Amino acid sequence: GTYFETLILFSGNLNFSTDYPIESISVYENNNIQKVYWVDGLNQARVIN
Amino acid sequence: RYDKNRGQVNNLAVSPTNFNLFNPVYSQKNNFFTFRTIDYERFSINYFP
């Protein structure tokens, strides 16, 4: 209603650079399988539920 | 056993070629309608938005 319920899904060393921003596609298959495919111009394509 | 050389006094010319011919089909189980157990806590989806 008045705030963003924030969760930290990950905190590590996914090699990320500011020169290579993120572009994403996210699908909704069901209540539990909610994926977000994203790609840099530098690193492998990745997925996150 | 589908041969007619059964229970006869003669039994002179009998052989594996004549005496115990067999039709396997009659030894059939209830294979058509078969079931199996299901795990309650396993998550198999049933929603297709």
Swiss-Prot record, chain B:
Signal peptide bounds: none
Domain of life, source organism: Viruses
Location of the protein in the cell: Virion
Primary role: Forms the muzzle assembly at the distal part of the tail. May serve as the gatekeeper to control the ejection of the cargo proteins.
Complex and partners: Homohexamer.
Protein name: Muzzle protein
